[PDB]
């Protein structure tokens, strides 16, 4: 269909003949420079390549206010997520309307020149409530208060280049490029599938069925910009998508990566997704159950209703100009060796099988079997490599402050003891001396599968520097992961406590 607003705002194309000129200006000594943050880089790529058509810059207060309260740009164009350039006061103060500033990536690569229209301090309390529903635990609200700048700079953009990416050069198609890929294949009906997770057998099945019903080709369009905290890394996911696209009938599907920064904003995000896929050339779009939903908060309540997304999108159906295809999740029928829509089974007493996210996680943690009816083996293999089981995981044992036994001797005893076991894990007594440059390497060694023996705790104000995954405290305190009977417990008894704790937790298998 036609881009949202009618014209694809591909600014790279629009400004092609101004590239040298804009680059020189961006590099002039007198121009103010703002280094884009990771989320701003995702957003600016989508504005610059027309993925956010009709947007041609970051929203000034006029459009922003209208999006916050009315889900529309000031001119009435449907638009549910505010895209703004958030900066701190020190920068906002040296800015005024008409000022032209250079926007860089990594303080080295000029990306665009922004012509300032306005500078404002938005009420982040109202934004959180009106756009993200108010729950302080909502990923977007957490970001909005703890990470985002307090000042928004509205303005028009002129393109120099899209944010630099060295991985997957072939798969990161812009809207113009994707439309040409579809055109060269004579594809005029394409149904897009959104995802920020690995794809299992059920997803392959549901997308092929969607294609069959809409008489459309398939576009697997995963998000590789920012997704939900804790999600599988995009490199692992892309490997999974590259593997699964090979399981579709030849010529039915195309894989392209979307550098979007999701807000995990449920229904409003679903509408935003529909618009973006339309800009990218899709004729149809699948809106999932709890689409773009961040789950439940700490008290167990849903941030969004499971069908809020499908209902909001349905309310705007007459002006979206992209067909939404009903979501028919499928499940496996052992006795029939096939998959069927969950809305069509049971009631007649029919056996079904499924593996939840929690169960999948468990199996990967213990190195357990994962059935081919659930996920293609080549996909499972990829997931195991990126998320190895306990016998292959790294860890750290921290000698707590309470210890009065020799820390040097206890560290040496632990190292010598661990070196007896087979397995191939690399071990090291690691002294950080409370230095950030050393503390930040702890998770790097753990991520490499190594076992670190840390002779002393770091100061509390350094905690934030060390991730807590697989880090265990050996101490007398009740908070200790491995509790000592006493501060001067004999070294040989301490060693045994540690070895048995590690075995009980799967790090050692005998």
In whole angstroms, how far apart are CA 361 and each of 264, 357, 370, 389, 424?
22, 6, 11, 10, 24
Asked if residue 147 binds a second copy (CB under 8 A), the reply is: no
In the list 99, 177, 197, 236, the residue contacting a second copy (rule: CB under 8 A) is 177
For Mg ion, the closer CB: 111 or 439: 111
Which of 251, 300, 422, 424 touches a second copy (CB under 8 A)? 251
Tell me: does residue 162 bind Mg ion (CB under 5 A): yes
| Known active-site residue 195 | yes
Active-site hit among 56, 80, 174, 195: 195
SS (H, E, C) 168-185: CCCCCCCHHHHHHHHHHC
Site size for Ca ion (CB under 5 A): 3
The contacts of residue 380 (CB under 8 Å, 6+ apart) are: 370
Q: Does the protein bind a second copy through residue 185 (CB under 8 A)?
A: yes
Residue of the chain from 90, 107, 146, 170 that contacts a second copy (CB under 8 A): 170
Residue 251: which of Ca ion, Mg ion, a second copy, none does it interact with, CB under 5 to 8 A by kind? a second copy
For Mg ion, how many residues bind (rule: CB under 5 A)?
Answer: 3
Active site residue 130: no
Of the residues 308, 310, 312, 446, which one makes contact with Na ion according to CB under 5 A: 308
150 binds Ca ion (CB under 5 A): yes
Name which of residues 98 to 117 contact Na ion (CB under 5 A): 107
- Which region, judged by CB under 8 A, interacts with a second copy, from 5-13, 129-137, 172-180, 387-395? 172-180
Q: What angle do CA 131, 134, 137 make, to 5 degrees?
A: 115
Q: What residues does 446 pair with on adjacent strands?
A: none
Q: Least distance to a second copy from the beta carbon of 255, Å?
A: 12
Q: Is 197 annotated as a binding residue?
A: yes
27 in a labelled binding site: no
Question: Do 112 and 103 touch, CB atoms closer than 8 A?
Answer: yes
Contact 288, 273 (CB under 8 A): no
Cα 50 to Cα 63: distance, rounded to the nearest angstrom: 18
185 contact, one of a second copy, Mg ion, Ca ion, none, CB 5-8 Å limit per kind: a second copy
> Of the listed pieces 91-99, 158-166, 223-231, 333-341, which binds Mg ion according to CB under 5 A?
158-166
Identify the residue among 91, 120, 168, 421 touching a second copy (CB under 8 A). Answer: 168
How does DSSP assign 104-163, residue by residue?
EETTTEEEEEEEEEEEE---HHHHHHHHH-S-TTSHHHHHHHHTS-SEEEEEEEEES-PP
Count of residues of this chain found to bind a second copy when the rule CB under 8 A is applied: 11
Stretch that binds a second copy, among 86-94, 155-163, 179-187, 447-455 (CB under 8 A): 179-187
- Residue from 76, 97, 134, 305 binding Na ion (CB under 5 A): 305
Q: Could you say whether residue 135 binds Na ion (CB under 5 A)?
A: no
For strands 85-87 and 151-159, give the pairing.
antiparallel
Residue 302 contact partner, candidates Ca ion, Na ion, a second copy, none, CB within 5 to 8 A by sort of partner = Ca ion
Residue 146 φ then ψ, to 5°: -85, -20
Q: Which of 165, 384, 392, 462 binds Mg ion (CB under 5 A)?
A: 165
Strands (E), 271-414: 284-286, 323-325, 330-333, 338-341, 395-399
Verify binding: residue 163, Mg ion, rule CB under 5 A. yes
The reply on whether position 59 binds Mg ion by CB under 5 A is no
Binding segment for a second copy (CB under 8 A), chosen from 182-190, 306-314, 360-368, 399-407, is: 182-190
Query: Of the candidates 359, 488, 493, 500, which one interacts with Ca ion according to CB under 5 A?
Result: 488
Is 253 strand, coil or helix? strand
Catalytic residue among 179, 196, 204, 263: 196
**Residue 289 assigned as binding residue:** yes
Instruction: Classify each residue of 257-288 as buried b or exposed e, where b means 16 or more C-beta atoms within 10 Å of its C-beta.
Output: bbbbbbbbbbbbbbbbbbbbbbbbbbbbbbbb
Three-state secondary-structure class, residue 445: helix
Q: Is 281 in the site for Mg ion (CB under 5 A)?
A: no
Contact yes or no for 447/394 (Cβ under 8 A)? yes
- Could you say whether residue 249 binds a second copy (CB under 8 A)? no
Half-sphere exposure of 424 (CA within 13 A, CB side): 6
Residue 184 as a binder of a second copy (CB under 8 A): the answer is yes
Q: Is the peptide bond before 266 cis (omega within 30 degrees of 0)?
A: no
Partner residues linked to 10 by β-bridges: 49
- Given a contact cutoff of 8 angstroms between Cβ atoms, the answer to whether 130 and 265 are in contact is no
Catalytic: 197? yes
Query: What 3-state class would DSSP assign to 257?
Result: coil
The verdict on 161 binding a second copy (CB under 8 A) reads: no
Beta bridge partners of 38: none
Of 334, 397, 386, whose CA–CA distance to 361 is shortest? 386
Nearer to a second copy (CB atom), residue 186 or residue 479: 186
Binding site listing for ATP:
194-197, 288-291, 330
Binding site listing for sulfate:
194, 196, 292
Q: Which residues bind Mg ion (CB under 5 A)?
A: 162-163, 165
Binding site listing:
194-197, 288-292, 330
Q: Which residues bind Na ion (CB under 5 A)?
A: 107, 305, 308
Q: Which residues bind a second copy (CB under 8 A)?
A: 168-170, 173, 177, 180, 184-186, 251, 254
Indicate which residues carry an active-site annotation.
Answer: 195-197
């Amino acid at each position: 269909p036609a881009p949202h607003g009618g014209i694809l705002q591909d600014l790279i194309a629009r400004d092609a003949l101004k590239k040298n000129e804009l680059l020189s200006e961006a590099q002039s000594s007198d121009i103010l420079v703002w280094n884009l943050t990771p989320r701003q880089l995702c957003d600016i790529e989508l504005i610059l390549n027309g993925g956010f058509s009709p947007l041609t810059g970051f929203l000034n207060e006029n459009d922003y206010s209208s999006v916050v309260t009315d889900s529309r740009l000031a001119d009435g164009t449907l638009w549910t997520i505010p895209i703004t350039l958030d900066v701190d006061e020190a920068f906002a103060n040296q800015i005024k309307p008409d000022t032209r500033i250079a926007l860089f990536q990594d303080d080295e690569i000029p990306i665009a020149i922004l012509t300032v229209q306005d500078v404002y301090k938005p009420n982040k309390t109202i934004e959180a409530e009106r756009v993200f529903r108010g729950d302080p635990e909502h990923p977007a609200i957490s970001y909005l208060f703890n990470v985002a700048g307090d000042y928004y700079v509205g303005g028009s953009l002129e393109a120099i280049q899209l944010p630099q990416h060295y991985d997957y050069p072939g798969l990161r198609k812009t809207p113009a490029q994707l439309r040409l890929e579809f055109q060269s294949r004579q594809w005029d009906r394409v149904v897009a599938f959104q995802t920020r997770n690995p794809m299992h057998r059920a997803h392959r099945e549901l997308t092929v069925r969607a294609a069959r019903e809409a008489n459309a080709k398939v576009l697997i369009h995963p998000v590789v910009g920012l997704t939900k905290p804790g999600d599988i890394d995009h490199h692992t996911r892309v490997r999974v998508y590259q593997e699964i696209i090979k399981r579709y009938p030849n010529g039915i599907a195309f894989l392209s990566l979307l550098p979007l920064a999701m807000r995990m904003s449920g229904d409003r995000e679903a509408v935003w997704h529909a618009i973006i896929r339309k800009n990218y050339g899709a004729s149809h779009f699948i809106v999932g159950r709890d689409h773009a939903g961040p789950g439940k908060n700490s008290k167990g309540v849903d941030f969004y209703g499971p069908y809020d997304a499908q209902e909001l999108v349905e309310s705007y159906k007459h002006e979206l100009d992209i067909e939404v295809v009903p979501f028919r999740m499928v499940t496996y029928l052992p006795d029939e060796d096939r998959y069927a829509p969950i809305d069509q089974i049971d009631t007649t007493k029919t056996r079904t099988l499924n593996i939840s996210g929690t169960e999948l996680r468990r199996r990967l943690r213990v190195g357990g079997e994962i059935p081919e009816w659930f996920s293609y083996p080549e996909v499972v293999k990829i997931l195991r490599e990126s998320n190895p089981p306990r016998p292959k995981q790294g860890f750290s044992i921290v000698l707590g402050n309470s210890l009065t036994v020799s820390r040097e001797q206890l560290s040496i005893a632990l190292l010598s003891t661990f070196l007896q076991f087979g397995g191939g894990r690399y071990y090291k007594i690691f002294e950080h001396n409370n230095k950030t440059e050393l503390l930040s390497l702890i998770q790097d060694f753990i991520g490499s599968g190594s076992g670190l023996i840390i002779p002393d705790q770091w100061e509390d104000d350094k905690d934030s520097v060390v991730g807590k995954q697989n880090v265990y405290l050996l101490d007398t305190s009740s908070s200790a992961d491995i509790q000592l009977e006493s501060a001067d417990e004999p070294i040989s008894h301490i060693v045994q406590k540690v070895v048995l704790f590690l075995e009980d937790n799967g790090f050692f298998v005998f």
